[PDB]
UniProtKB/Swiss-Prot annotation, chain A:
A GO molecular-function annotation: structural constituent of ribosome
Record lineage: Bacteria, Bacillati, Bacillota, Bacilli, Bacillales
InterPro entries: Ribosomal_uS15, Ribosomal_uS15_bac-type, uS15_NS1_RNA-bd_sf
One GO CC term, this protein: cytosolic small ribosomal subunit
Alphabetic keyword roster: Ribonucleoprotein, Ribosomal protein, RNA-binding, rRNA-binding
Name this polypeptide is given: Small ribosomal subunit protein uS15
Originating species: Staphylococcus aureus (strain NCTC 8325 / PS 47)
Function (record text): One of the primary rRNA binding proteins, it binds directly to 16S rRNA where it helps nucleate assembly of the platform of the 30S subunit by binding and bridging several RNA helices of the 16S rRNA. Forms an intersubunit bridge (bridge B4) with the 23S rRNA of the 50S subunit in the ribosome.
One GO process term, biological-process aspect: translation
Superkingdom of origin organism: Bacteria
Alphabetized NCBIfam families for the sequence: S15_bact
Swiss-Prot record, chain B:
Native species: Staphylococcus aureus (strain NCTC 8325 / PS 47)
Signal peptide: none
PROSITE patterns documented for this protein: RIBOSOMAL_S18
Any one Gene Ontology molecular-function term assigned to this protein's record: structural constituent of ribosome
GO cellular component: cytosolic small ribosomal subunit
Pfam family, one: Ribosomal_S18
InterPro entries xref list: Ribosomal_bS18, Ribosomal_bS18_CS, Ribosomal_bS18_sf
Protein role: Binds as a heterodimer with protein bS6 to the central domain of the 16S rRNA, where it helps stabilize the platform of the 30S subunit.
Keywords carried by this UniProt record: Ribonucleoprotein, Ribosomal protein, RNA-binding, rRNA-binding
UniProt name for this protein: Small ribosomal subunit protein bS18
This protein's encoding gene: rpsR
Single Gene Ontology BP annotation: translation
Family: Belongs to the bacterial ribosomal protein bS18 family.
Quaternary data: Part of the 30S ribosomal subunit. Forms a tight heterodimer with protein bS6.
Curated annotation (Swiss-Prot), chain C:
Keyword Ribosomal protein: yes
GO-annotated cellular components: cytoplasm; ribonucleoprotein complex; ribosome
Record-linked PROSITE patterns: RIBOSOMAL_S6 (PS01048)
Lineage, broadest ranks: Bacteria, Bacillati, Bacillota, Bacilli, Bacillales
Physiological role: Binds together with bS18 to 16S ribosomal RNA.
Family, similarity comment: Belongs to the bacterial ribosomal protein bS6 family.
Pfam families, sorted: Ribosomal_S6
Gene name of the record: rpsF
MF GO annotations: small ribosomal subunit rRNA binding; structural constituent of ribosome
Protein name, as recorded: Small ribosomal subunit protein bS6
One Gene Ontology term from the biological process aspect of the record: translation
Highest taxon of source: Bacteria
From Swiss-Prot, chain E:
Name of the molecule in the record: Small ribosomal subunit protein uS11
Source organism of the structure: Staphylococcus aureus (strain NCTC 8325 / PS 47)
NCBIfam families: PRK05309.1 (NF003698), uS11_bact (TIGR03632)
Keyword Ribonucleoprotein: yes
Protein family per UniProt: Belongs to the universal ribosomal protein uS11 family.
GO BP annotation list: translation
Amino acid sequence: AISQERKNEIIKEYRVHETDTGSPEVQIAVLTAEINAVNEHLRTHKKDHHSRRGLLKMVGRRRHLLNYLRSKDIQRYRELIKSLGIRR
Amino acid sequence: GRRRKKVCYFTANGITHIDYKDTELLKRFISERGKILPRRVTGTSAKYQRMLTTAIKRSRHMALLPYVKEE
Amino acid sequence: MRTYEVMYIVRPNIEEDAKKALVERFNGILATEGAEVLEAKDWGKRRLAYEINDFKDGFYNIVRVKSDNNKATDEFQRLAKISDDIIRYMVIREDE
Amino acid sequence: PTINQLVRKPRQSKIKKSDSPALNKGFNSKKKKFTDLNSPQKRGVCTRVGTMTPRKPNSALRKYARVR
Amino acid sequence: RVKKNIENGVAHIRSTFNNTIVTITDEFGNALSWSSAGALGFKGSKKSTPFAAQMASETASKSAMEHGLKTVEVTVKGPGPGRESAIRALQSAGLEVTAIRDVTPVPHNGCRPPKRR
RNA sequence: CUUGAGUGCAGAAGAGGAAAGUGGAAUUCCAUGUGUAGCGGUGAAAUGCGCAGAGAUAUGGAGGAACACCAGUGGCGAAGGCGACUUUCUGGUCUGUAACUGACGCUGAUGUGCGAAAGCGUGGGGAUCAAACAGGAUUAGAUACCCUGGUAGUCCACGCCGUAAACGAUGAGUGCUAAGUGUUAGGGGGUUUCCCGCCCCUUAGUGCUGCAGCUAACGCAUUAAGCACUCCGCCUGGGGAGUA
């Protein structure tokens, strides 16, 4: 859907400190999983407008988080985009 | 204001109910004509008012309530 | 991942025990998909608030299931219209 | 407007058009080239003369003529 | 079959703006007898005069009691000004109507009817 | 560094979306049964329906239609619009939250999606409704309208459609600023049995009166049309002509 289960599952790893709430690496992992799920929904919901707008904003915000991870960091970004395979 | 109706009848209920388990509370929720005693003259908050109304309208669709009731 | 309830009105005209086998087989075809079935219960005899075809009486059955969008609501929404001894249904979220 | 869109724009005025189409000789008598001559006067002939009538009460009969 | 003799039928009352078609029925039910206000001389702008409804009710009620009947309900549909007066003169006309039922069953946002007027 | 942003936990939150199914009263049509004599629209009616049953009835369905109340400044939305029920698998709502990387933010040319209705291409439906229409009043003429029926299409599939009063002709976000005074969800404190009962503080919106302010006036006025800020578009008399 997702809920905090898979969220925490995929944040178990990229946390600079395991208590962090910025450092979007784990967060962009969550966003990746969630946009995948909503795209499955979109393939299920062929016509609408909510999935379109939601994917627009979500993927854009995650893109900007990556851009930050490319400006704030230089290796974490790439290592994500090769591991996560998103926003390369 | 505003123009809702009496509350605190939930002294033995709340916050969310029922949906259907007491036909008698629904007897007092809205009118008996099939028409709906409005939130203006029912009272509970639009969250609970809306949920109770969709409960009763389902009961209508559930045949637990008549969609329209005759006399 | 979600939760989903369901009501439905099994009818008085049909045989009570054959319909009982039918509704327990419903409990099967609902729960066997990983559906967190909680309880199914029979209202018993009652005057319908309004009949649909000829059914002055009828029985009700309610289920609670804590499950995603694709275990019971998907499958039985179709297995309900094929269900002919029964007049109607109402699947809902599992919150009451 | 915002400073940036002000920059990427000229804030154009509402410059008028001379309601007197006074295109004087300019390049009329060579190449027939249209030329905005603003001359206060050109020489030329009224090939026809006429007289439209005004309405009442002031029946001040005004006379016209078509000119080149 | 013709006029199904019961002592408690339903007197179906329609009173349009250019007709008052009012009839006796049963709860079974079926139509037995009626009359139209336009049919009864009141015509044109008069096809639904209050006394047109009154006398059409007279016809229908009279036929109802010669069917053999004392009590009767009223299915009062066509919206008219004189149909209620018709009802009153029927109650006083030897009929024992006790269920005054002016019926205008609205559908549930039923399909858009002929609306223009 | 953090609150903004993030996201973090706890909740609260729903006509939001689109797919699917379920019901209902019933437009209309029609089955059956009864039943007239007229229905019929009017000034008269014509017509048009119709005596073999019209108009009407009661029993029965059909199709398609949008869903009787709620409904409200409820709400969702960014709008179009979004209300029968349900689910689909998601989009969004906020209270609190401070979880802590550490500005990650900003509106947004181009681009660009989404999107009343009609119309329409195609392929179906057509239940109404319905232009045109004609019968036909009316009157040489009668579509003029008052009829009767029916009518493209409305309605289903996608496109074309992308347009409107989509209007608040109030771009967005920011944060400040008397009040009274509600709401819609929150929360807290005390208050008391759940204070739910009260009050009050704000959370975030949506009120009415009104400080100041400002508007030609109108009025807003914490939700400013008051104060300011980055970012969009328009407007340039009328109209000519949204038309070429």
